């Protein structure tokens, strides 16, 4: 007679934590912001079009110089574009055609991919030979690879479909820590600006916050009513937004342990595929399943803009580090940039 | 100031090389058919050729039969990738319920694949595999299909269904019943964008790959005719 009583413990604790976070829930956010001047009408136009891919584009990533962006498609190619001049620099082939993620190193020296092959392939761009090949092949997951992000030129954190996120070491080639605790598949993760802790959404309507130093889970946020597709931190590192498949976006807080705002509308009935904040954090950009991506207001929860243009489903949405431009890849092999 | 022109020329040359390579491998990407192969389990998919990718070629046509036997059993996420695939091969094991009622699970999985939002345009090849084992499943009488299906007792063999020379009328009846269950699911929902191609696997593989090639050709022809607003 352990399981039977074990559930109660959780239940008891659940109610206690529920109480704590709802007790400190005095005001909302809207109220505390009703006073602010709304951003008003915002108009965007596609400045550049990147027609180089063959199959659907499923993930992209901006570089730290806000000039070079890498893109990954299901045709087996990993193209490194150029925002300012629309010139491909490296169209490197890939072994596994079903790539589901890509990343760009903060120093601009490495890129990484990964998909159904269960392997996080890391590529080196500073080869003395010139031609770029794969340097290290990380293989320690059982489920598919969904999102990978570099911390530095030495260690990379990867999400997986086996409910376990892991921190890798490129020099050795083995997992340093293992962030077990999720129940469903893990879709996306984002790193905080200080690179000390990170959040990771999954397919159980939960966005667990981890600590890379201790290798354990610190805060677990529930609120969505369906599996979570994409997440991203607020520029200050004290908040992050989560876009799930229930056609709702929610901003959470790491010091209140409770959701602050719900970005839900009646007309939208399709789930969110990608989400990313702006430079100042005033504009929240989300990518929807209805062929277009909207631009929500992070404090007024009103559609301040809609960015159409894409024919098929959008899959990735990146904002430059300096906030000058926004890129939107979709399932039509196109990469529109917006200003 | 000549630095700007020479770096621009170098970048244009690199872009031209990238375009040439992209055209060269797009010329071959369009000619190779992709084929997702998934099943309930213990179906005997190793006889197709006799860590999961494999390829074959028939009639100067390339194929990529992508096995997924390494992932988990939660298919609602990684199956969205296989929406540009030409034909989702769905092999079923109708005689693997001895160790569960796998037939109902296969039917539900087929219904979920058929009615998915992103799999609307993907046709499905159906393989009623382990067909020879159906005969012993009814003579022994340990487990009856009619026990797990109440419409089997009131079922009659189709008039246009050709009996296989040397098959007990009851096996043919059971196999055509199962075919029709899958085909009811297939036609109940919208089917203007994709079609189902039921088949019965035999003991040799020289005809199975020919069947797959013929069905893929039919799918391509129907897509081309639909593009021209014919059907």
């Amino acid at each position, epitope marked *: 007679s352990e399981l039977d009583q074990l559930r109660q413990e959780a239940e008891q604790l*659940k109610n206690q934590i529920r109480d704590a976070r709802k007790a400190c829930a005095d005001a909302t956010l809207s109220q505390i912001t009703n006073n602010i001047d709304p951003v008003g009408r915002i108009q965007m136009r596609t400045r550049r079009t990147l027609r180089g891919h063959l199959a659907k584009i499923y993930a992209m990533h901006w570089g730290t110089d806000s000039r070079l962006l890498v893109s990954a498609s299901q045709d087996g190619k990993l193209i490194i574009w150029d925002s300012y001049t629309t010139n491909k620099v490296h169209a490197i082939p890939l072994r596994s055609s079903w790539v589901m993620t890509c990343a760009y190193a903060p120093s601009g020296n490495y890129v990484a991919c990964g998909g159904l092959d269960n392997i996080c392939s890391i590529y080196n761009l500073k080869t003395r030979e010139g031609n770029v090949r794969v340097s290290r092949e990380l293989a320690g997951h059982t489920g598919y690879l969904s999102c990978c992000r570099f911390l530095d030129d030495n260690q990379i954190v990867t999400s997986s479909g086996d409910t376990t996120c892991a921190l890798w070491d490129i020099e050795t080639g083995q997992q340093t820590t293992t962030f077990t605790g999720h129940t469903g598949d893990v879709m996306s993760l984002s790193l905080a600006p200080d690179t000390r802790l990170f959040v990771s959404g999954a397919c159980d309507a939960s966005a667990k916050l981890w600590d890379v130093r201790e290798g354990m889970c610190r805060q677990t946020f529930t609120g969505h009513e369906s599996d979570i597709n994409a997440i991203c931190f607020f520029p200050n590192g004290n908040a992050f937004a989560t876009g799930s498949d*229930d056609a709702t976006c929610r901003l959470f807080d790491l010091r209140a342990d409770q959701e602050l705002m719900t970005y839900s509308h009646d007309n939208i009935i399709c789930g969110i595929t990608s989400v990313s904040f702006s430079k100042s954090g005033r504009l929240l950009l989300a990518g929807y399943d209805d062929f277009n991506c909207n631009v929500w207001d992070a404090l007024k929860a009103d559609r301040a803009g809609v960015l159409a243009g894409h024919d098929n489903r959008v899959s990735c949405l990146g904002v430059t580090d300096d906030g000058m431009a926004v890129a939107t890849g979709s399932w039509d092999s196109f990469l529109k940039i917006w200003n | 100031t000549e630095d700007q022109r020479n770096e621009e020329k170098a970048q244009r040359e690199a872009n031209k090389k990238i375009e040439k390579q992209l055209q060269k491998d797009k010329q071959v990407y369009r000619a190779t058919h992709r084929l997702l192969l998934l099943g309930a389990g213990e179906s005997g998919k190793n006889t197709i050729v006799k860590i999961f990718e494999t390829k074959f070629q028939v009639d100067k046509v390339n194929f990529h039969m992508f096995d997924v036997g390494a992932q988990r059993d939660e298919r*609602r996420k990684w199956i969205q990738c296989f929406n540009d695939v030409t034909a989702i091969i769905f092999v079923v094991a109708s005689s693997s319920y001895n160790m569960t009622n796998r037939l109902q699970a296969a039917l539900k999985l087929f219904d979920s694949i058929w009615n998915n939002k992103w799999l609307r345009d993907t046709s499905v090849i159906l393989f009623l595999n382990k067909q020879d084992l159906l005969a012993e499943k009814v003579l022994a009488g340990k487990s009856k299909i009619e026990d797990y299906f109440p419409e089997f007792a009131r079922y009659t063999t189709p008039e246009d269904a050709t009996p296989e020379p040397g098959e007990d009328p009851r096996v043919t009846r059971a196999k055509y019943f199962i075919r029709d269950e899958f085909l009811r699911i297939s036609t109940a929902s919208g089917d203007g964008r994709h079609y189902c191609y039921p088949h019965f696997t035999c003991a040799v593989d020289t005809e199975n790959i020919r069947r797959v090639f013929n069905d893929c050709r039919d799918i391509i022809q129907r897509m081309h005719l639909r593009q021209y607003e014919l059907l």
Partner: nanobody
Amino acid sequence: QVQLQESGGGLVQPGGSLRLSCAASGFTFSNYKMNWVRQAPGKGLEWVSDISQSGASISYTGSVKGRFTISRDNAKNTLYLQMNSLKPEDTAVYYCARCPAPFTRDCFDVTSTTYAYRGQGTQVTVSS
């Protein structure tokens, strides 16, 4: 926080009638297709019945077709499965399951091992 509770069940004389009530709280009950999945002791999970968003499309497994009925009440956020004429080989634990995608006609919840949106269940036995 999704939470599916399965009240009812217990010990029943073979041939009796039990009404299983599934309590849901945490999502819009009217937007999801809800199913009933059972697991007999000795083998894996198997789908029993289902119901559409409004309750029009209703299906059953052939082994329990006609004997069992399913009904949903959207205004109370509850799922009802009423048992009739139980049989000895109906001894199993019944999980109330929901689908992961709202406003969709296809979904993949039969998964046995680890499916989040499924309750603890209620294990039922027939009398001897």
